[PDB]
């Protein structure tokens, strides 16, 4: 985890997405220093939301503007500054 408002919560993820998936999807907006999908630790199933950290707040802002409302797997992502 890093800087500022450089941290994002992403909701309505495809349940099949893992850490690497979310990392690669958000790297186009800048240097991602950590990315995590949250899972139910009994079933190991994704909770369909996760966390992404950039090394700068402008990347996070760009990611929000581009990926909030973005449709993938018949859902629209909800991308939110933490």
UniProtKB/Swiss-Prot annotation:
* Tissue and organ distribution: Expressed in frontal cortex. Isoform 1 is expressed in brain and lung. Isoform 2 is expressed in heart, brain, placenta, lung, liver, kidney, skeletal muscle and pancreas. Isoform 4 is expressed in heart, lung, skeletal muscle, kidney and pancreas.
Its annotated compartments are: Nucleus; Cytoplasm
Instruction: Give the superkingdom in one word.
Output: Eukaryota
Where does the RRM domain start and stop, copy by copy? 6-82
Q: How does it assemble?
A: Interacts with A1CF.
Which disease annotation does the entry carry?
Developmental and epileptic encephalopathy 97: A form of epileptic encephalopathy, a heterogeneous group of early-onset epilepsies characterized by refractory seizures, neurodevelopmental impairment, and poor prognosis. Development is normal prior to seizure onset, after which cognitive and motor delays become apparent. DEE97 is an autosomal dominant form.
Task: Give the protein's biological function.
Answer: RNA-binding protein implicated in the regulation of several post-transcriptional events. Involved in pre-mRNA alternative splicing, mRNA translation and stability. Mediates exon inclusion and/or exclusion in pre-mRNA that are subject to tissue-specific and developmentally regulated alternative splicing. Specifically activates exon 5 inclusion of TNNT2 in embryonic, but not adult, skeletal muscle. Activates TNNT2 exon 5 inclusion by antagonizing the repressive effect of PTB.
Q: Which family does it belong to?
A: Belongs to the CELF/BRUNOL family.
Name used for this protein in its record: CUGBP Elav-like family member 2
> What species is this protein from?
Homo sapiens
Covered residues of the complete protein?
418 to 499 of 508
């Amino acid at each position: 985890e890093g800087p500022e408002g450089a941290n994002l919560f992403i909701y309505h993820l495809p349940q099949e997405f893992g850490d690497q998936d979310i990392l690669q999807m958000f790297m186009p907006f800048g240097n991602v220093i950590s990315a995590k999908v949250f899972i139910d630790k009994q079933t190991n199933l994704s909770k369909c939301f996760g966390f992404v950290s950039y090394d700068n707040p402008v990347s996070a802002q760009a990611a929000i503007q581009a990926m909030n409302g973005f449709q993938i797997g018949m859902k629209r992502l909800k991308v939110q500054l933490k």
